[PDB]
Amino acid sequence: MKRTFQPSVLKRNRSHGFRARMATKNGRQVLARRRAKGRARLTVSK
Amino acid sequence: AVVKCKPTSPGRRHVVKVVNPELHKGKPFAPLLEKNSKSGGRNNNGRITTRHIGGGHKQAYRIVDFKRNKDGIPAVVERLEYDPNRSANIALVLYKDGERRYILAPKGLKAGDQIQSGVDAAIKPGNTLPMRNIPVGSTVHNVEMKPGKGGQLARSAGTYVQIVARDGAYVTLRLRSGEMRKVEADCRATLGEVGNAEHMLRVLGKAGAARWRGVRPTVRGTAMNPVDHPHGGGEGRNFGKHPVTPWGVQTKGKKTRSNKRTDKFIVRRRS
RNA sequence: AGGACCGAACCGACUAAUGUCGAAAAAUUAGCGGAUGACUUGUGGCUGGGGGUGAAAGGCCAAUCAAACCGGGAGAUAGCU
RNA sequence: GCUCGCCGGAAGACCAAGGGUUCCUGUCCAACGUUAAUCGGGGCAGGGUGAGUCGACCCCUAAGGCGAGGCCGAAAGGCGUAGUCGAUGGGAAACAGGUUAAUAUUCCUGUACUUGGUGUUACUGCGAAGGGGGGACGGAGAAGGCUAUGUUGGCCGGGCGACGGUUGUCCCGGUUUAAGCGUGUAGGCUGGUUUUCCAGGCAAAUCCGGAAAAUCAAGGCUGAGGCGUGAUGACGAGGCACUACGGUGCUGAAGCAACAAAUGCCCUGCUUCCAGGAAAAGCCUCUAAGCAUCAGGUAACAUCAAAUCGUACCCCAAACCGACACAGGUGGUCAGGUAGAGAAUACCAAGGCGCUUGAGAGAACUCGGGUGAAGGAACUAGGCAAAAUGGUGCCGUAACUUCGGGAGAAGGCACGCUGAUAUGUAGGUGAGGUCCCUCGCGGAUGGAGCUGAAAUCAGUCGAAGAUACCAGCUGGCUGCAACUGUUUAUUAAAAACACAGCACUGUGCAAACACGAAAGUGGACGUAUACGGUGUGACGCCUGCCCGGUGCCGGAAGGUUAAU
RNA sequence: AAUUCCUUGUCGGGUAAGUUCCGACCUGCACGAAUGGCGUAAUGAUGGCCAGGCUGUCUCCACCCGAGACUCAGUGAAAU
RNA sequence: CUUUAAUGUUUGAUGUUCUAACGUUGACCCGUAAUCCGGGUUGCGGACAGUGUCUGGUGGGUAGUUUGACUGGGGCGGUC
RNA sequence: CGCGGGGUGGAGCAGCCUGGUAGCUCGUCGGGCUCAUAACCCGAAGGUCGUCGGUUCAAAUCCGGCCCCCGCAACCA
């Protein structure tokens, strides 16, 4: 079969990355809630 | 000249190609070419605004001098060329001062004939001049609408409009569709008629024959489901409804003309 | 020259058998169609929920679609079990 | 360690993606491994990834994204100019041998190249976000010239051999060499040079383009491979010698010729047809605003710099995605021998594996298959499944037909090996000799050698000669749909969809129409031989009657008629 | 008839036997001329029918070679 | 009261002409290497077009809902 | 089996909705026009209103049973 996960780290960071999240208003609320819940690895990064 | 191909294969038995050895068999004038990345019917938001458009072959852009701003300058029609974007031919015209410019190729024209523009040009196909300097009843094309805009009317293959009269300030024309539109005397026109009239006799023959041209397959309304179109549904292609567009607007007879800002221009409407 | 022919790669997936708590949350084997084209494919982008996209089946949209998933209205309502 | 077996256009060797030490060594066996385990991708401790020339970072951009002002919008925010990012694209430069338990186009040895900085000597006018050229490009086909590579012969070295022959037309092994430089070829492109003038290229211009004279006939550009050099260097089968018996150290002959021939290269070619096939920078060059005893540019030499990061291992899989050590999926390059048209297939070379449960029994029954007396579809919803035809050349081939097809129709004949034609022919290739020359990688002539189909005849062997793998069932009538194509990913691939063609109708362009509160865009940098929608679905023959009902269009006098 | 309910209508062909097929008769429950009609060479992993060839489909199954099934040793589920 | 006649006066409905509102997805220039935009010239239309408010009409394109019960199962029929 | 409609001179159809009165065309008979027929012209005749019964002053009409004909329905498993 052809599963639904063909990894490519560049695409992983251009749609879910830190600077991609910071690019919008609602995106900033995402990073806010992550810090609200007290998560160590906020978003997908190195 | 046209040609009906011999049935050497299924699908090929109907094709008709319009050929003319006048066309330069090589690469065009590069300095007047710019790119043209397509759209496929997608706007700024990317939504498909118009259907059936997309695909096709990569085409370059040939800048055509519609302003015809050169004045009182002799020009030799160097070599006729093939143009992707349009339906007619485009002639590479070389001027006396050494400035090469592309222009829409009319009928009465060959690789080596003389032309000129301005208000002093003679009455020969290819010559451009304001409509108040052209005799009543003649043939012209590439007719402008606004003074110095460039040209809006009759630019396609085998297309020409006929000046019906000239009442002082206004110049009445009989458009290609069959209108009676008044255009100001400051607008330039090109005498003669656009060449390659057999374009309308062109038969594609293949499904892909329209594919690489840019056309994508259309889906009939009766074949779809009641959600995606006002038509569709039922058991066995029933219709029972007045034919409309995919957005409920009545088709097959319905004036959608709503301008009113330029209704003083059109004297008689289309037949 | 050919949306040409036979036929590998490659793509697709008509028939049967096995498989059905399988090796596998649609696979394998033995036969199959296309195979210079409306072909196929890697990478990189783009369109989004009453919308997107669709050679149009109401198919597909992260195994979920006649309206996805996550959280909040909300301990919804329930003459029902 | 010795045999057997298996893949071999992969189950081989290398990269990207993505993983993240899974690589190596020592040590250990509880847990992981579907069994034991002193074994391992498992634990613990340690080691290993060395770059000016590879890639990325960098320069320059495409799709597309963001976006100073600005347009617009309850707010959020949407769009977009200047600019700035963004490769999967273009742009400078390195190859051979050796070396580790593990990395090396990175280390070492040998031999070179690329772009800048500074300084000096000798000349000389340089110089932009500006102009021009270049970069720079489509699909297919045929041919010519070569290479990787392979085969044979020569040469060199070893052997002459556990059952009969085997010093001979015998057998086995090796016969390798790049980057760069010099030369500039087969082939390909274009007529050069000098002078004058110009509303031309946002201004200018000696650069390009164009318009006229002139002189001479070639010059110039581009370009695989070959020949020298690189290189009396390395490598090299095999010996010579120490063993912790893993391998280390020393030494080292031949190293040519011919033929066949790529999907590789010349080719980013040439021809043809059409659906007519990116951008910008690096680079070359001309000038503006200016600056000139300056400054800079060209050339040569010397010297310095070339920074940062990745570099292990896996890479068609026990390490990626699939919950697993999962018969699935995963892009790119190299890709040999014999037979063969071939990357099919068959058996093997290089290399790597025997798939992490086995040992016996040989029941029904189940799965994968083999063969089968007589009959031959009586099976059954139905010839589903099997069986069968199956290759090349020649003979031969109907109804019908859009004159292409139908058609590889059907149905048949000849196929091994040996010798002869011919101590291997037609043909391909091609050295020496001879001759000429605008003397070189030249052109004729010349024919050794190498290599090599098919046809014909005769003879002989088997039951069977396309003896294997591989490899069409055919014909007749007919419904439906024209045809290739597309779809229910994962029970329906069709008579459904699309289709070219046809028709009606809407739209005169700030167009109809569509998304969007708006702006702005798509439509189109197109314009009625165009574009949107709808309906039918090649082509041939046609396509009749009805305007009452519903809708649409045209005409508005009168009745009625909201707000005011 | 992809349309025909009645119906397996009637007639002729094909078979020893034909509700299917093929060619016609028109009695069209309820075909019909771009929600296109009637034909058509080529084409179809399409529907239906017949013949030849071919064979284990079958009459009626038989034997044999492999992988399980059984036994021994180790590990060790499941639905209910 | 009806028919009518000149004038003053009160406005409405049309025709025509003009430029200053406004539009300008025409040409030119500048901010500026910038097809955005804005300002200044000029040409063309022109008190139209367009926008807002109120309002008539059309309108399944879109949204929220009804779509009865008994019934010797429900539907049809029939009843209330 | 149910719903609705219909049955009228010899034939084909109105009149029924809202009970006292039945029409049109063709056809038939007889005469006339022509030498003869049809057509044309003129005049007259012909209806137990499917059947029985009833409510009613009065029934073709309004209701009930029955007969025949026509269309629709006769369903989902």
UniProtKB/Swiss-Prot annotation, chain A:
PROSITE patterns hit by this protein: RIBOSOMAL_L34
UniProtKB keywords: Ribonucleoprotein, Ribosomal protein
GO cellular component, as recorded: cytoplasm; cytosolic large ribosomal subunit
Domain of life: Bacteria
GO biological process entries: cytoplasmic translation
Pfam families from the UniProt entry: Ribosomal_L34
UniProt xrefs under InterPro entries: Ribosomal_bL34, Ribosomal_bL34_CS
MF-aspect GO terms: structural constituent of ribosome
Subunit structure: Part of the 50S ribosomal subunit.
Similarity remark: Belongs to the bacterial ribosomal protein bL34 family.
Protein name: Large ribosomal subunit protein bL34
Organism: Escherichia coli (strain K12)
From Swiss-Prot, chain B:
Annotated GO CC locations: cytoplasm; cytosol; cytosolic large ribosomal subunit; DnaA-L2 complex
Keyword Electron transport assigned: no
GO MF annotations, alphabetized: RNA binding; rRNA binding; structural constituent of ribosome; transferase activity; zinc ion binding
UniProt feature, compositional bias: Low complexity: 38-47
Database matches in SMART domains: Ribosomal_L2 (SM01383), Ribosomal_L2_C (SM01382)
Modified residues (N6-acetyllysine): 241
Keyword hit for Acetylation: yes
Pfam families linked to this entry: Ribosomal_L2, Ribosomal_L2_C
Gene3D superfamilies the UniProt entry points to: 2.30.30.30, Nucleic acid-binding proteins, Ribosomal protein L2, domain 3
Key words of the record: Acetylation, Ribonucleoprotein, Ribosomal protein, RNA-binding, rRNA-binding
One record GO biological process: cytoplasmic translation
Location of the region described as Disordered in the Swiss-Prot/TrEMBL record: 27-52, 220-271
Subunit structure: Part of the 50S ribosomal subunit. Forms a bridge to the 30S subunit in the 70S ribosome, contacting the 16S rRNA. Interacts weakly with S6 in one of the 3.5 A resolved structures. In pull-down experiments interacts with CedA.
PANTHER family assigned: LARGE RIBOSOMAL SUBUNIT PROTEIN UL2M, RIBOSOMAL PROTEIN L2
The protein's role, per its UniProt record: One of the primary rRNA binding proteins. Located near the base of the L1 stalk, it is probably also mobile. Required for association of the 30S and 50S subunits to form the 70S ribosome, for tRNA binding and peptide bond formation. It has been suggested to have peptidyltransferase activity; this is highly controversial. In the E.coli 70S ribosome in the initiation state it has been modeled to make several contacts with the 16S rRNA (forming bridge B7b, PubMed:12809609); these contacts are broken in the model with bound EF-G.
Note: This protein can be partially replaced in vivo by its H.marismortui (HmaL2) or human (L8, from the 60S cytoplasmic ribosome) homolog.
Entry's family note: Belongs to the universal ribosomal protein uL2 family.
Official protein name in the record: Large ribosomal subunit protein uL2
